[PDB]
């Protein structure tokens, strides 16, 4: 019975010590509890947006920490089965670092233009039998134009649980794991990407080890 990979590692929360990779202090030190102006604030973003500091929204640190924990746990347990994670960042704020982290890990990124269907019509531009991404981590869903990334609709149109670093200008309508947080500060995105790299790397390492030990049975 080599099917223990679908039971043993899933019967525990934060098995890879995901709660220790970050914390409330780690977020407070990176200025993640910030938000853009409250002018174009989204309706469904009000519960997350705790307060404001003169046209500057502030998000509760506990909610953001819990969302980060859940999203990282899900991403790790998905990579535990070669879960093809997909990054998105068209704002050009940290596309270089995001691509470098994706290279260091086994995930991929889609920080370029969305042509004639890259996920809904991936049978023509690519091969016929191509496993589509089972997870999308929107690093910067807000592109240069006043409009969120269109990949959310494509993901919803293909049954894909997506993660997103949502903010005040975002629209967490169909995101399965919204991650409220700041997107203007550089240290915030740096910490985000470092945590992602470490988490996915540890997930892949534990995957290899445990899968080998189980198949050896």
């Amino acid at each position: 019975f080599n099917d223990k990979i679908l039971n043993e590692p899933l019967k525990h929360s934060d098995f890879f010590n995901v709660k220790e990779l970050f914390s409330v202090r780690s977020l407070f030190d990176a200025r993640v509890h910030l938000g853009h102006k409250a002018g174009c604030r989204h309706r469904f973003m009000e519960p997350y947006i705790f307060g404001s500091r003169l046209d500057h929204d502030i998000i509760d640190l506990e909610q953001t920490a819990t969302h980060l924990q859940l999203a990282l746990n899900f991403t790790a347990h998905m990579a535990y089965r070669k879960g093809i994670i997909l990054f998105i960042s068209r704002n050009r704020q940290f596309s270089y670092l995001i691509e470098n982290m994706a290279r260091d890990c086994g995930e991929y990124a889609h920080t370029r233009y969305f042509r004639g269907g890259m996920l809904t019509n991936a049978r023509l531009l690519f091969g016929p039998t191509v496993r589509l991404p089972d997870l999308i981590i929107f690093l910067h869903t807000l592109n240069n134009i006043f409009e969120p990334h269109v990949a959310v609709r494509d993901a919803a149109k293909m049954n894909i649980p997506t993660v997103g670093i949502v903010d005040t200008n975002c629209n967490p309508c169909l995101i399965t794991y919204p991650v409220p947080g700041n997107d203007d500060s550089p240290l915030a995105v740096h910490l985000y990407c470092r945590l992602f790299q470490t988490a996915i790397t540890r997930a892949k390492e534990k995957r290899q080890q445990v899968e080998a030990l189980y198949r050896l049975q």
Binding site: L34, H36, C40, H56, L61, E62, D184, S185
Partner: protein
């Protein structure tokens, strides 16, 4: 996980209060093609070009004083029921050190 109240209280962006006529010092977060977007915490970073008086010391990890003026920069134009953000600050530069 320490105290959530103290951490939310004592923070740089909240400690600086309403940025207005505050000389802030910082470094450049990313070299620009022909500008000088110097960072300094807060909510946004200033925007300007290289000055004529000493314009080489500006490096990725330096310390140059700014002024911090209007960290929002927004204005409801005509029919736009919402705001039009620019993600800038625009402040008068002082010098080096």
């Amino acid at each position: 996980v320490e105290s959530f109240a103290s951490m939310l209280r004592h923070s740089p962006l909240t400690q600086m209060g309403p940025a207005k006529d505050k000389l802030v010092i910082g470094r450049i977060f990313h070299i620009v093609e022909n500008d000088l977007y110097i960072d300094f915490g807060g909510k946004f970073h200033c925007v300007c070009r290289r000055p004529e008086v000493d314009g080489e010391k500006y490096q990725k990890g330096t310390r140059v004083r700014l002024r911090l003026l209007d960290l929002e920069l927004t204005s409801r134009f005509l029919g736009a029921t919402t705001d039009t953000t620019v993600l800038e600050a625009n402040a008068v530069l002082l010098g080096i050190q």
